[PDB]
Swiss-Prot record, chain B:
Family: Belongs to the RNA polymerase beta chain family.
Protein's name in the database: DNA-directed RNA polymerase subunit beta
Quaternary organization: The RNAP catalytic core consists of 2 alpha, 1 beta, 1 beta' and 1 omega subunit. When a sigma factor is associated with the core the holoenzyme is formed, which can initiate transcription. The rRNA transcription and antitermination complex (rrnTAC) consists of RNAP, NusA, NusB, NusE (rpsJ), NusG, SubB, ribosomal protein S4, DNA and precursor rRNA; S4 is more flexible than other subunits. In pull-down experiments interacts with CedA. (Microbial infection) Interacts (via flap domain) with Escherichia phage lambda antitermination protein Q; this interaction renders bacterial RNAP resistant to transcription pausing and allows it to read through termination signals.
S-S pairs: none
Annotated function: DNA-dependent RNA polymerase (RNAP) catalyzes the transcription of DNA into RNA using the four ribonucleoside triphosphates as substrates. Resistance to the antibiotics salinamide A, salinamide B, rifampicin, streptolydigin, CBR703, myxopyronin, and lipiarmycin can result from mutations in this protein.
Shown chain mapped onto the complete sequence: 349 to 398 of 1342
UniProtKB/Swiss-Prot annotation, chain C:
Gene name tied to this protein: nusG
Domain free text: The N-terminal domain interacts with RNAP and the C-terminal domain binds either to Rho or to RpsJ (NusE). These domains are separated by a flexible linker.
Stated family: Belongs to the NusG family.
PROSITE patterns according to UniProt: NUSG
Residues in KOW domain copies: 103-134
Lineage of the organism: Bacteria, Pseudomonadati, Pseudomonadota, Gammaproteobacteria, Enterobacterales
Protein name listed in UniProt: Transcription termination/antitermination protein NusG
NCBIfam families named among the record's database cross-references: nusG
Keywords: Ribosome biogenesis, Transcription, Transcription antitermination, Transcription regulation, Transcription termination
CDD domains: KOW_NusG, NGN_Bact_1
Function statement: Part of the processive rRNA transcription and antitermination complex (rrnTAC). The complex forms an RNA-chaperone ring around the RNA exit tunnel of RNA polymerase (RNAP). It supports rapid transcription and antitermination of rRNA operons, cotranscriptional rRNA folding, and annealing of distal rRNA regions to allow correct ribosome biogenesis. Participates in transcription elongation, termination and antitermination. In the absence of Rho, increases the rate of transcription elongation by the RNAP, probably by partially suppressing pausing.
DNA sequence: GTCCTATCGATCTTCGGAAGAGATTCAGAG
DNA sequence: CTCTGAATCTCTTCCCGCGCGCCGTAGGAC
């Protein structure tokens, strides 16, 4: 009654969240320093961390 | 008995002691000790009960 | 009076360190707290720290460490980072303002298709600002001539 | 694309080890 | 005022063979 089961669809979700947290960490700064005009959403993010 | 062991005085004292013991080598500041305390247990980025 | 302060910075990101500070000063509108952040460079002796013309406020102390790629300043204690000196600033501003190919010498080419190869000087093309170094092509020490900027001493 | 310099130089490293002993700090008092 | 107690810190230790399987520097500048 105190130990619970995590499955693939949850551990994978957590890892995806970690990837997205790194991506957000980068792109917040990029948007703060970016000129926001010529930028397009593909420029904001790069797949590599996720 | 905890009151008898407490060397701190008030909310400013609480933040000072929390900041010093949490981050040795880091100077406390009123605007910054809140940035530490809220992130500890009240800020979504670093606290989420499922 | 804004005494200079030295800050540790990601080597190779030092330019982004100065710029990321430059933006953050204006965004946090602490323009009345910062002079310029020096990154002296020659044709950058120490790929490393930065010098910031600054004053010492707790808001500025946390501001610099709130710029990316910045651990903090170099000083006696973390509570109070220290400036550099009176004369040290002047000396840095002074410097910021202020090999012959021997026959028989073994060099490597610096650029071109022959770059980074074991060559031996064969003759002296001095007055033309050129070079001529033997190379191992066809199994021979064929005479090959190159530019001066192809030296690797 | 290849070839170079460097390490979270704006974090948070994992809390689900016992233990066994020295070492290093702190009491009640001579 | 600092002497012998404990009290809290760090450092070190944990059977042995075999046999696969896989996985194994990174970002940005010219």
């Amino acid at each position: 009654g105190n130990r619970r089961i995590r499955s693939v669809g949850e551990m994978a979700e957590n890892q995806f969240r970690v990837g997205l947290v790194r991506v957000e960490r980068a792109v917040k700064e990029r948007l703060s320093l970016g000129d926001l005009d010529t930028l397009m959403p593909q420029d904001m993010i790069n797949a590599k961390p996720i | 008995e905890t009151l008898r062991v407490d060397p701190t005085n008030d909310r400013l004292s609480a933040l000072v002691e929390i900041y010093r013991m949490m981050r040795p080598g880091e100077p406390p500041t009123r605007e910054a000790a809140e940035s530490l305390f809220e992130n500890l247990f009240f800020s979504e980025d670093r606290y989420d009960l499922s | 009076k804004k005494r200079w302060y030295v800050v540790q910075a990601f080597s190779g990101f030092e330019g982004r360190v100065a710029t990321s500070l430059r933006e953050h000063i204006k965004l946090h509108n602490m323009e009345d707290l910062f002079g310029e952040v020096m990154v002296p460079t020659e044709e950058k002796f120490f790929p490393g720290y930065v010098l910031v013309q600054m004053v010492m406020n707790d808001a500025s102390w946390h501001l610099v460490r709130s710029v990316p790629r910045v651990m903090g300043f170099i000083g006696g204690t973390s509570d109070r980072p220290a400036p550099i000196s009176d004369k040290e600033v002047d000396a840095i501003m002074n410097r910021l303002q202020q090999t012959l190919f021997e026959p028989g010498e073994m060099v490597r080419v610096n650029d071109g298709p022959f770059a980074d190869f074991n060559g031996v000087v064969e003759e002296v093309d001095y007055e033309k600002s050129r070079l001529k170094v033997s190379v191992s092509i066809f199994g021979r020490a064929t005479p090959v001539e190159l530019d001066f900027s192809q030296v690797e001493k």
